[PDB]
Amino acid sequence: DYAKKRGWVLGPNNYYSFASQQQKPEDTTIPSTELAKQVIEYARQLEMIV
Amino acid sequence: VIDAFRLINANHEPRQTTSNLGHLNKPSIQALIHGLNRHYYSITINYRKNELEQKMLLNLHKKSWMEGLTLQDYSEHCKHNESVVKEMLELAKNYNKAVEEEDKMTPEQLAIKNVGKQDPKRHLEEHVDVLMTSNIVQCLAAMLDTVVFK
């Protein structure tokens, strides 16, 4: 009953994979807009009259 | 350096003044020695332009669009960064040495202290500016290309 309550796959008898992979996040997209914004902020602070 | 001239007859004043426009140039000593306001007088030069002349003069220095997005060899970029940082190291040593001075220095002696001798603070500032400009430009161009080209 508790195995059913939790999200356990219930494989072979007394064999429930826990999927510790956590999807193994490997996709990477080079966040580019935010990095461009950061560098532009750097330039703004370098150039602006304080 | 350009000027316009006309002669004065053997007479009185050569011209009539109905405005301040004439008396705005402060004639040069050389021209005065060589005969200005005695044998000839100057005339103001103006550079009125038309729209197409203005546009062409402004466009002269405009570069091709691809040059703007073009990146810069990463090997050369890294080599330049490395060279400048290595130079900044010695400049920092010299800056540490110089900071210990400026207290054992006469108020007049400080000005002539930087005559014939390097200025670590000034050189550090210049190197910092060049490094910041180059690296910021390269990073921003890289990101912009990353998005624009798929």
Swiss-Prot record, chain A:
Subunit text: Component of the 19S proteasome regulatory particle complex. The 26S proteasome consists of a 20S core particle (CP) and two 19S regulatory subunits (RP). The regulatory particle is made of a lid composed of 9 subunits including PSMD8, a base containing 6 ATPases and few additional components. Interacts with DDI2. Interacts with TASOR.
Family per similarity comment: Belongs to the proteasome subunit S14 family.
Described function: Component of the 26S proteasome, a multiprotein complex involved in the ATP-dependent degradation of ubiquitinated proteins. This complex plays a key role in the maintenance of protein homeostasis by removing misfolded or damaged proteins, which could impair cellular functions, and by removing proteins whose functions are no longer required. Therefore, the proteasome participates in numerous cellular processes, including cell cycle progression, apoptosis, or DNA damage repair.
Protein name: 26S proteasome non-ATPase regulatory subunit 8
Record organism: Homo sapiens (Human)
Lineage, uppermost ranks: Eukaryota, Metazoa, Chordata, Craniata, Vertebrata
UniProtKB/Swiss-Prot annotation, chain B:
Phosphothreonine sites (modified residues): T106
Residue spans crossing the bilayer: none
Tissue and organ distribution: Widely expressed. Highest levels in heart and skeletal muscle.
Positions where Phosphoserine occurs in the chain: S64
Chain's role: Component of the 26S proteasome, a multiprotein complex involved in the ATP-dependent degradation of ubiquitinated proteins. This complex plays a key role in the maintenance of protein homeostasis by removing misfolded or damaged proteins, which could impair cellular functions, and by removing proteins whose functions are no longer required. Therefore, the proteasome participates in numerous cellular processes, including cell cycle progression, apoptosis, or DNA damage repair.
Subunit details: Component of the 19S proteasome regulatory particle complex. The 26S proteasome consists of a 20S core particle (CP) and two 19S regulatory subunits (RP). The regulatory particle is made of a lid composed of 9 subunits including PSMD4, a base containing 6 ATPases and few additional components. Within the complex, PSMD4 interacts with subunit PSMD7 through their respective MPN domain. Interacts with TXNL1.
Family: Belongs to the peptidase M67A family. PSMD14 subfamily.
Protein name: 26S proteasome non-ATPase regulatory subunit 14
Organism: Homo sapiens
